[PDB]
Design a protein around this ligand. Structure first.
Ligand code: CA
Ligand code: CA
Ligand code: CA
Ligand code: CA
Ligand code: CA
Ligand code: CL
Lengths: 376, 376, 376, 376, 376
């Protein structure tokens, strides 16, 4: 993930031009090899035309270039790129939204699984660790970075997400399918046990716990579904073939022909196709957006930081359900206890935001006539 | 389903070019027959023009080719293809999301339907089998592969999803409509019976069971609705007619005319329309995306693996509610019990991900002046 | 509703060409009258130009045709058609999704409203009949076919959806607005009465009943809202005017001028504008998609089969809550009771689906080095 | 709101041409002044060119017209209009969906707030009046028509939505922000009181009431948010500037130049730009769609009938919770009590809908061979 | 936020032209510097061509201008701008919808946390202050204005959102990640304590409180996610590069060449490219829409008024849970108690809205024949 939100907080004169100077996760980094290859092919053709071909061969080459320039149709490429990249970007954001987060479960556990003793600590920590273990299993299934961090269930166990007895049961389960749901079933059974023991004080609390567990498990399954059901290969190949056909048409028909021959629209020999290179940059980077976002769980600069998410989720859930359980500050009157209204102060840099009228609605400036306001 | 997620984990220099070498679920496999037919018609016209037609007939043919080349308008067909294919692909993903999954129900059943004895096992297994049976009935109603696997209710019974007594009741039900909902009503009645017997310990647990059952049944009904309400036939015919009109215009107007006649834009005779074939590949494959995805329950390479889903769902649900019921490892202290913080180790291949700054928010680099930070 | 899902189960060489041979719900059926009118106007103009006009009048007509051919712009009409038709299609699918279905309510009623006696039967049947009656009232308010089937509340009463005493109360209610919600209020009161009498055994069951009732009533209200708030008339008129302007431009500028005059792009007299007719078919059918889908409750071939839905819903709900109440087969061990795993058999036509690798995730082929897998 | 759903129930030969004859909420009504102004400017320029300019001035004017006709690019304005109008239309429908409706609340209140006496009547009526009062306050904040109907809280009180003591408390509340949420807080407190008194018989019923109250209040707040956060002014100005630039380009470059000068594409002088006027109608009406829908709470013909909605909601909720409370017809056997199946009769106008095959699924015509149907 | 909803309440003849006269949040304010720079570059090139270049240099410059004018393709930039800006606008509205609002929580707290004494006041105020504190922490993490108002946790404490003891606990929490969730966990613990003490009278009320807390915390986390996961930098750079390439092509190829040279389409020398400047305004403002909306938490005129939202939320929640707790007006009969129907009066300005027919449905004008209405 390359974050530049602070750089674009305000619409400034520099604007996106300063973003054009960025390298990590950038179009230059994604596309310089392809640009070099395209330029190499173009320059090889140009050198052959200028120095190798005979006169008749050059005439035939000019005819071919003129013919091929007619098929540099950019409009269908723009259509298909726009639709395909929009679909890829929407799927990418949906995939991010499908990442399982333990915050709701940790709030529910801290509020419903009780006991300051070691047994209550064990219950809360084990439930949160089950959620984290399901997340780790699905993430090592779907993400290359997470798999590299946890290449084996031995690595998962030695990392602390799974214990040895839990690993024994996990391996003894007879299933040829991915077992990311097993810690969720463990969570359900443990919540039932805690309710039976009275650690969970009410059936409504148990129901809330199971509902949040099902939300978390559904997000894990959503990640699995996104990993399994790829964007249609036929669609991807169609867009790639369209872009490559346009690039071939440009590679042939954008050659600079001899101005002495007096061809229409061929009277300047720049020896470098600046605008063709810019168009290649535009379209190839437009496809590179989809190339980077199609699997957001790889190791691209703009891919999701799944290992950081794992670390943060586990640490935060453990803190919330162990260190912060029943650890409230004593109830005390707030600063605005005696004040009928309430408003925090403003700094010198933000006091200008005051004196802006408080929006009440858009209809409070009509100022009707007195005769009109009387009811029938 | 053709999965290439691993191949596109990272945006590499090879990129989608390597995907262009794939055959299963590919544009080549979907389109080579149509490409051959188009090339055959084009070459038949070319051979007739070159060898059969007289001089006057060739002059008339050249006039016709010039006239027909004017109507090879690619922009409108690009418009209609983009919109129609976007609709089809969104509907395809929605159809995948409407597939009934037993994971939520199996978690709820394992957590709420109690008893280690044979009666509790029977209750849990029968509830999960009812869910699986509803899924099987709707899938054999909507999917050709599932129907071929279960051509008869006799096949469904012999597969174990239905018992003989359940089949007797199912057949004795008097309805002229599809009976995929019958196992869901059975599930509801059985859950009520289990709550009455005390196997389900609370009304909240019963309510959660019925809510998850209704979600599952709603997904089954959504599959039925997608099977029934097709994409509008008028829309499909409109896009097909537009594409075929463009292809006819190209078939006539992309013929190579005699360069001796000196027609404008007709001075090169390649004898093979490379760019016309590439445009045909692009547009025909763009339509083939919708052709393959319009019914994702057929037997195309990119269609959903519904039989695999049935097997996985039944096996996993049976495991979760029978083998793993009340089968937790003994509660034990985790690896980070004494550690105030927590972080799993990193491998050599992933330790580079560390030292990346931990994102706290985009506003924590502003560095205001001292005078500005003072409250009013 | 015209269903062709089976015809497009697989992407085949025939593909959508076979769909082009369909008549019911087809572009030909929707558009042959308009095509005939367009061809008649074009042929009248052509005949006048060929046989009636003098030489000077023909010269002026040729100038007018050349002028008008410049305004046959395809991109703007394609744009507006694409956006408007996409909006109409999305709204049409949303309208289908807003159809009230009694399946969730019938499952809840079968699981929560108890009693094998006549009073329990009356309670369940009356609740489901109230849901069906609300559906019938809203459907006769919004659908021409349903209104033709139930032109009067007397027709509704003799149909069995409403009783005579219920009709007395319904008409004695003093409201100038549509009363489709009245059976939902009756449902709420009857559920409260059943809970008070102990037929509903728990407050959670009553809450679930009321939640599903509110979902059903919300769907009925959504149907009313879609019926009331039409697609903006200004938008519809804009798209119609754009299409008609393009068609007028074509009607004038696509006339075949005398080749003897030697006009640019006018040297062939086909006497039949094949490509203009194809473009008219394309655009007029594209608009006919929206014309058919704008009100999906009419009597078009692709409109929703609301009367069939009413019949199916009532029959299925009555079966579920009366015939199938507490009518379960005796709990018996399933076929895979002793089997640790489970997999239903495959037929000869589907056994090829086996031997396909079971997808575990996309990261399980990385095969890291031994040195890279060691934790820090 | 201009409703034409009945006119477009079926896709007929007349189709949208009949809609072209409508005046209320029409493009003609929205656009005739702008069309007149455009025609006046064009005619003033044409008259000056024909009768005022000298020969050299006419030559310069012809050069200017030819130059300006090059910039009448309709493609970009089509893009920007399509995207902007699609955004506006989607936002408009979302705004309609955000209108607070009391149907769910009235069903819950009639089912959960009990007592046939004056106190129970007071409880139910006061809860529904609180919901209606919140709706009225937000609607008079966001809608010009509702503000004109209720210009003052005195008008709101005298209309019956608020009492005098409630107004005393409402004005005694010290808040500089809009107080539409105050009746919702009153609703919450009153529901708590009713549960405490036993009028609400269960905590689950109280929870359902509070959930529906929160849904209603969320809809009110969403209306406030839509009123506050307008469509970006920069976006609106961009689309307006693009349309006006295109119209200026047309106003200059669509002038009819003297045919005697023999300019290319200038040889016919129609004295009236029919196609330019049609293009102006198309594009200006396309923008007028967004102009009308951007604030759907004004007084346009296609704006929402908010006062009608207020009247209907109040009347219907009052009926539902007061007149219809515990007023059910005696439970009686329905028409299909003894019938195993059920189907309402069909009229002569709809009996043709029968004999259509009952859809069972798309896979029930495969007709496999006997050999293929045997399990492995 | 710049609100102009009242200005566009109705579609008037002035319409968006009056909006074109606005300055705050306007395209002029966002774009005048870039317009000046573009005009300066164009005028520098024009002055060099007119006064500095020799004759041969001017001939080469004219050839270069003619060459570069061919690459001023507006269609690709139109596509990419439309798609990218649509994505940005949708994401911007989603970000606004992700703003945490305390209204649902305050209603639930006022209805469920009981006690008129100081302890009940403390409970309600502390719960709402915890919600407000979570909102403040996430907003100072994601919004530049909120960070400038609260540059330090010392500022947060001195503003009254956090107490000193709560600050001690907050800082003693050992976490390297953002702690916006800590007040939510405090809320959960305090709600559990209140239920244990009997201040919360039922487990259902506690569950509702925890559900609304989870919704609020989810919105806070969604704000964090939007702040972290920026719009892809590759996509932003692609659109910027495309726009800049088009602007460079225009800067070169829109130069006014000497009319004496008699170049095609170069015969008028206006010395000011009015239409090129209008196109620059159009496209640059279209991108400036995304530039302003990409981070809606900066300090642009159209950015969200987050400090105002903080003030309003805290003040309103404090009022609702402290001043308005158990402070209802005495239950009294409403104005329409004796009236079977109900309708509030209309003013003179709105009485015209009456006499509009009350919409009952679109099917109530069919008027079938007597023979057709008879049941079969
Ligand atoms: Ca901003
Ligand atoms: Ca990637
Ligand atoms: Ca298929
Ligand atoms: Ca219709
Ligand atoms: Ca309006
Ligand atoms: Cl609940």
């Amino acid at each position: 993930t390359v974050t530049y939100t602070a750089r674009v907080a305000n619409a400034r004169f520099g604007g996106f031009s300063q973003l054009l100077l960025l390298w990590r996760g950038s179009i230059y980094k994604l596309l310089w090899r392809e640009l070099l290859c395209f330029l190499g092919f173009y320059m090889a053709l140009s050198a052959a035309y200028r120095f190798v071909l005979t006169e008749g061969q050059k005439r035939y080459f000019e005819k071919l270039v003129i013919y091929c320039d007619q098929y540099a149709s950019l409009i269908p490429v723009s259509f298909v790129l726009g639709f395909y990249v929009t679909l890829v970007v929407n799927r990418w954001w949906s995939q991010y939204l499908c990442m399982p987060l333990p915050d709701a479960l940790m709030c529910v556990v801290a509020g419903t699984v009780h006991g300051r003793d070691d047994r209550g600590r064990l219950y809360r920590r084990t439930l949160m660790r089950y959620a984290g273990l399901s997340a780790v299993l699905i993430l090592r299934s779907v993400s290359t970075a997470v798999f590299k961090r946890f290449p084996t269930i031995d690595h998962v166990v030695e990392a602390g997400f799974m214990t040895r007895e839990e690993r024994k049961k996990f391996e003894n389960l007879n299933s040829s399918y991915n077992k990311y749901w097993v810690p969720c079933v463990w969570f359900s059974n443990l919540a039932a046990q805690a309710r039976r023991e009275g650690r969970i004080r009410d059936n409504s609390a148990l129901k809330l716990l199971l509902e949040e567990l099902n939300v978390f498990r559904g997000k894990c399954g959503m990640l699995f579904h996104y990993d399994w059901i790829s964007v249609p290969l036929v669609y991807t190949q169609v867009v790639t073939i369209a872009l490559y056909s346009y690039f071939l048409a440009c590679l042939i028909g954008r050659q600079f022909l001899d101005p002495a021959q007096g061809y229409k629209d061929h009277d300047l020999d720049l020896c470098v196709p600046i605008f063709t290179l810019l168009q290649f940059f535009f379209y190839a980077g437009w496809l590179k957006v989809a190339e980077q976002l199609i699997n957001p769980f790889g190791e691209d600069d703009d891919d999701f930081e799944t290992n950081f998410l794992i670390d943060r989720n586990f640490q935060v859930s453990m803190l919330a359900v162990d260190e912060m359980y029943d650890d409230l500050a004593v109830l005390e009157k707030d600063l605005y206890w005696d004040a009928a209204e309430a408003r925090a102060p403003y700094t010198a840099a933000t006091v200008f935001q005051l004196r802006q009228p408080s929006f009440q609605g858009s209809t409070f400036d009509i100022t009707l006539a007195k005769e009109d306001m009387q009811f029938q």
